[PDB]
Amino acid sequence: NNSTGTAALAGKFQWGPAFQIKQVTNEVDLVNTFGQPTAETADYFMSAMNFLQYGNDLRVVRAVDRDTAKNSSPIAGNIEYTISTPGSNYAVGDKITVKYVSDDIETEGKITEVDADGKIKKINIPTAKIIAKAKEVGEYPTLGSNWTAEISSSSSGLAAVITLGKIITDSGILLAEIENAEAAMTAVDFQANLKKYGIPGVVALYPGELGDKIEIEIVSKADYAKGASALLPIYPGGGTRASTAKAVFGYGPQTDSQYAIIVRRNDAIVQSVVLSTKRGGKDIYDSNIYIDDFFAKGGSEYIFATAQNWPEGFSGILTLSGGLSSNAEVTAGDLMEAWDFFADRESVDVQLFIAGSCAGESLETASTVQKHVVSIGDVRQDCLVLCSPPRETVVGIPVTRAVDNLVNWRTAAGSYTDNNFNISSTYAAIDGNYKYQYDKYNDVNRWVPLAADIAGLCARTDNVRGQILNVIKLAIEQAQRDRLYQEAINPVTGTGGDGYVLYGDKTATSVPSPNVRRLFNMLKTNIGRSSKYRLFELNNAFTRSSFRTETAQYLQGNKALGGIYEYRVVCDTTNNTPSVIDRNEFVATFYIQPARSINYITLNFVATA
């Protein structure tokens, strides 16, 4: 696609998917998905955004702390409680009252499940009023001490003891990959509370406080006819609110195990569907509308649910809260776990690597992450890991100190002996100051890693250096320049106004000094893909031809278009075995010369056992 400028980016975002290679094409399409730049997200949003300016496709992976990220959920408003002593002879809508020091706060609680003897099995206390009072007096969500719960005075029956804990702030669920999808939705601990507080397993799809804005409305085939009158209750807050189901749906809930779901964010009816808790069941189109499956297959952009422990005939308003994406503390490693999603050509065809995106992070991590990212392109050698310097080193100080710093860092030397970037890959392109952009979102001028940009600037020019788009200032703008070149660092210089790329790129190594790389990288990548063909047929002398003819046609095309010159089909093609009667499997070895360079480079790719 000009050689398939597929970028690759991993970093912290305001919105999941977490640890998923979700692809992104638009700006307004990444905002939709990982959206606004927080002061902890900025350099990654930008990283993407100001790349999609030269960008076709970008593959991203959100780094979440797996230990403390949270998807908003319906659990996360309720209130700890343990039926210390089941009464006897109680019944079901016997009301419960929560007092603050012999003073009534909430009086709409109510026993909700007894057995044959009236033994209290389950209750439901609304927390709207109490968390209020509690916030109001420093006892949030601690609670416990002066907080007490008594029964109606009285229900038919006696003997009971309900004991109040704290306001649950742990949503109790985190969705990352889909291999684990509903397996987290079906964890004893999670599924436990879905029973305890008598609600369905419906959670926000992506870790993040942004999920708190979602509000599911559920109506069953039961309260659907009364769809207008039916006064849906609101969990866990409390109070009720006239249903809307029949006033939004034509095709109503069919079987008794089908439910109307209406998802809202900001009063907006973001999604409207009807699903069933019984496997097999379909709509009038034989579309499997069994909950677990529906969502199991990109069914919904917003939420995720599970038929498990879904209360029968449940109808009500679910209030998602406790949602919590924490970039707060995403450890450096938590980033490397993410990046790893790209470290195998078997799996993801990604041409470029946006890495400087960590420029801002803890100096340490600034270095050690990138350093590692290089060690992914290295071991795979189908890419370009392009990388940029740490803000510390380049933005604040004047150029005098500036360069000293950069060179120390590229070796060890002075201050950055420890957090050095002292590596040397022909795939390593480092990145040479740091850009000063404007942030249309927060509406502020901001420093961002320049690497993110040049990478898109590659998806462009040739296959995968011409002024950059939205810069408004660069950290720096002859001896040093020559020094930076040779160092194989990409500089930006400003002359007479307007800054331009000094040199074409790469942190090159043992190869001739020579754009030339992209030609070769592209050819090698394309040649290997043709390997699928090998499985198709057997290997013979003829197979030498055919494969040879196919690749040759590709190579010749490159020459005709221009890009490769002096390509001799005769002795620039493949024969794995030595020229002899004997032969072996074919490896594609080619000697190709980029148009502007009087040198032929030998590349060998092998398809063999």
From Swiss-Prot:
Keyword field contains 4Fe-4S: no
Source species taxonomy: Viruses, Duplodnaviria, Heunggongvirae, Uroviricota, Caudoviricetes
Family per similarity comment: Belongs to the myoviridae tail sheath protein family.
Keyword annotations of the record: Viral contractile tail ejection system, Viral genome ejection through host cell envelope, Viral penetration into host cytoplasm, Viral tail protein, Viral tail sheath protein, Virion, Virus entry into host cell
Assigned GO CC terms: virus tail, sheath
Signal peptide span: none
Name of the featured protein: Tail sheath protein
Task performed by this protein: Structural component of the bacteriophage tail which consists of a contractile sheath, a tube and a baseplate. The central cylindrical segment of the tail consists of a rigid tube, composed of multiple copies of gp19, surrounded by the outer contractile sheath assembled from gp18 subunits. A total of 138 copies of gp18 arranged into 23 hexameric rings constitutes the sheath. During infection, contraction of the sheath drives the central tube through the host outer membrane, creating a channel for DNA ejection from the capsid into the host cell.
Cellular location(s): Virion
Metal-binding keyword on record: no
Subunit: Hexamer.
Pfam families recorded: Gp18_dom_I, Gp18_domIII_N, Phage_sheath_1, Phage_sheath_1C, Phage_sheath_domII
Gene Ontology BP terms: symbiont genome ejection through host cell envelope, contractile tail mechanism
Annotated PANTHER family: PHAGE TAIL SHEATH PROTEIN, PTHR35861
